Amino acid sequence: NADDQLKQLSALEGANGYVIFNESGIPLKRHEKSISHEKAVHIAALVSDLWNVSKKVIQRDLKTPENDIEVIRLRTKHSYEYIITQSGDFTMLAIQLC
Amino acid sequence: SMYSTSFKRCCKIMERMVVQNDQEYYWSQGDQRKKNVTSICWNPLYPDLFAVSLGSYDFTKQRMGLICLYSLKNTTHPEYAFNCEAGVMCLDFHPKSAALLAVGLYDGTVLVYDIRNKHTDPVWQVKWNPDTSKNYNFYSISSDGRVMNWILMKNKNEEESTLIGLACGLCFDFNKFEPHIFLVGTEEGKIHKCSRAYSGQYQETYNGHLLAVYKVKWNNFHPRTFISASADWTVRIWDSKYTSQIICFDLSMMVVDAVWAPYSSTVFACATMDKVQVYDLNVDKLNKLAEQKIVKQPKLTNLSFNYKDPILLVGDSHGGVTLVKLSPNLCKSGPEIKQTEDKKAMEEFKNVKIE
Amino acid sequence: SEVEDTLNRIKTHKTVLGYLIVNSEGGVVRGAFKDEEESKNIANSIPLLTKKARSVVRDLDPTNDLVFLRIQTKLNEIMVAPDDEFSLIVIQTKG
Amino acid sequence: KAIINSSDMQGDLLQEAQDVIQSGIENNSAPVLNIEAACKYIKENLDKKFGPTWQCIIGEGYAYDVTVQNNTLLFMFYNGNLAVLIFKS
Amino acid sequence: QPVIKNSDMSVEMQKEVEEVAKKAIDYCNTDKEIATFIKDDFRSRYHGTWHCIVGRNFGSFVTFERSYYIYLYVGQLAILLFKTG
């Protein structure tokens, strides 16, 4: 819960680009734009809309309503790992090595 | 074609459709509730792969004989098996990589199977001799002692190729550096040595303690050090360079399986009666360094340590499998590694002390 | 035949609650569900999200295809095996 | 490197459309270029040439949904990854 | 958070633009559905023909009626609404 833990998190081996973005779609900090700034913007916007669709489905007809997203971690093996962790205001994403 | 392509997709689909999130306990009881674990082994080609063999006493069940294969991350039950009513023992694998499987049948015969595919004396031991140029030789010690050996590229394997060596003991250990030389403990109370050039070239006997020895191994480290253990519960450090053994060490349960640990430490282990007695001679004297009884099921059978993690795997006399992890005793990391040759010199010093 | 073998092995796999074999369309060939309409809404809309998923996994680049979609929730486990003609979904206990 | 993807109009206007998008690339060919200026140029040129109510659109990843007059629609791709749509309404 | 970038309508019609956009955001997750919501809403309340584009990386050049045009950002979406016919 501090910049010390954040630096440790950056030090987590295997992770390539971290992307924390406010639910408004604003990547606050990052380590993916540190390689290419046009990546995390596209990713944040696209995945925020994806998480909205996920909300629709987590609220559609089988998943009882009032159940929220908790963590949507995806992985495209040999490409990268991409964790999504929703927050009330934030969304923690990370592009790690699969 | 569409059905077959969907099948190829669905194969790996099920494969990693079983693997779900877990903390890392795989206690296998596939049938083997009435079986008895006869052997456990691991695979170098797949460091996460292990093959077990058991012998059954109850014929009212699935089949006869046993070879079961499974990985560390796969479901508790054996993933792949070989089905037939043939009692199978003396199991070994292709030396370069797991492509051929060899088994020494109970009637003295030998069989070989393509892994990449769907006599008045039994054989006692089996070994591959890796000749990288082609197929890899096969040596089987029979229950009378006599050794046989051959290999053929056609594996449907034809025992027409054969060579015979006048051998008296049952479990033949081979010299790690020079594979032609071998030794064995005989029921007559001696430990014979010889080699592959002549079965009668070098017919003297090791007489460290001069007892009926039924187990031999080799220190998987720098020296030409081996070990031989007798029916009289005695363990014997056969240094190849000596005719008198180094440390005539001594403990109950030395008839049974012994092993060098896959650590830098020269750790020893004996195991019967759901009880393992463990030696770490790299940190302490020849007294037992650890001992453990197991209440999971009685009468522990064969074991396996892998170098990767201390998830030690073991079977029971009831045919089941289990595993435990005690990581604090993993490694000491300073005395075991480069002081081990000094430790073997110190064992020779203990011999000079014995004198 | 392999579809039969794999459906059989899924049935053998304990902890499964509701099996769901569909085609590439929204057709549940077999389902171990108490109500079929629930499985209908899923076996229809989940292929839509699967089209979205293949869309994005190619939006990266045509380097990989969606081999699996295996999700685990607190209550159960939705295994999804995308297949050429089929899709192998099962509701299991997340053990 | 013009890669026509969807055609509706006549081949002459096809050729002139390609020429005009090319000329727009040259009008704005630099890392400081914006697709908007080339878009202005395309639309205004096709106005003063083949009549008003033209519409130029450039990008690579997007989703349009527009109403178009028949034989007045084109969409295409560039090896430089420029997806270019044009249409009259 | 609507951000008007280029509008032509009166302040009331603009307020209606952002209100209908907020409603479409509240209800529909897909851009096509949002745009159809807005377009049909305005074509119904007024009379004529409206067109709405919703995107994220988008430029165009269109003709439009006078005081019948807006280009804005509601939240983080590019809404281009106009009236032609």
Numbering used by the authors:
A (entry chain F): 6 to 103
B (entry chain d): 235 to 258, 933 to 939, 961 to 1047, 1062 to 1099, 1114 to 1312
C (entry chain G): 58 to 152
D (entry chain I): 22 to 110
E (entry chain H): 8 to 92
What text comes from the article?
Axonemal outer dynein arm (ODA) motors generate force for ciliary beating. Each HC of the axonemal dynein consists of an N‐terminal tail domain followed by the motor domain. This includes six AAA motifs (named AAA1–AAA6), with a microtubule‐binding domain (MTBD) connected to AAA4 by a coiled‐coil stalk, similar to its homolog cytoplasmic dynein. We analyzed three states of the ODA during the power stroke cycle using in situ cryo‐electron tomography, subtomogram averaging, and classification.
In the pre‐PS conformation, the dynein heads have moved ~ 8 nm and the γ MTBD ~ 13 nm proximally compared with the post‐PS conformation. In this pre‐PS conformation, the linker is in a 90°‐bent conformation, which is similar to the single‐particle cryo‐EM analysis of cytoplasmic and axonemal dyneins heads in the presence of ADP‐VO4 (Roberts et al, 2009; Schmidt et al, 2015), while the stalks are visible and point proximally toward the adjacent B‐tubule (green and yellow in Fig 4G–I, respectively). The γ stalk of the prestructure is in an extended conformation, attaching with its MTBD to the adjacent B‐tubule between PF 7 and 8. The stalk of the β‐dynein appears to be in a curved conformation, similar to the conformation it adapts in the Shulin–ODA complex (Mali et al, 2021). A weak density between the PF5‐6 on the adjacent B‐tubule suggests that the MTBD of the α HC binds to the B‐tubule with the α stalk in the usual extended conformation. In the pre‐PS conformation, the proximal region from helical bundle 4 for the γ tail and 5 for the β‐tail up to the dynein heads deviates from the post‐PS conformation. To fit to our cryo‐ET map, the γ and β‐tail should move together with the LC‐tower around 1 nm proximally and 1 nm closer to the A‐tubule. With the combination of rigid body fitting of the crystallographically solved cytoplasmic dynein in the pre‐PS and the recently solved dynein HC in the Shulin–ODA complex in which ATP binds, we were able to generate a real‐space‐refined model for the pre‐PS state, which agrees with our tomographic maps. Our finding shows that the pre‐PS conformation of the α and β‐HC in the Shulin–ODA complex and those from the ODA bound to the axonemes are almost the same. We have built a model of the pre‐PS state (at intermediate resolution) and show that the linker, head, and stalks of the Shulin–ODA HC represent the native pre‐PS ODA conformation.
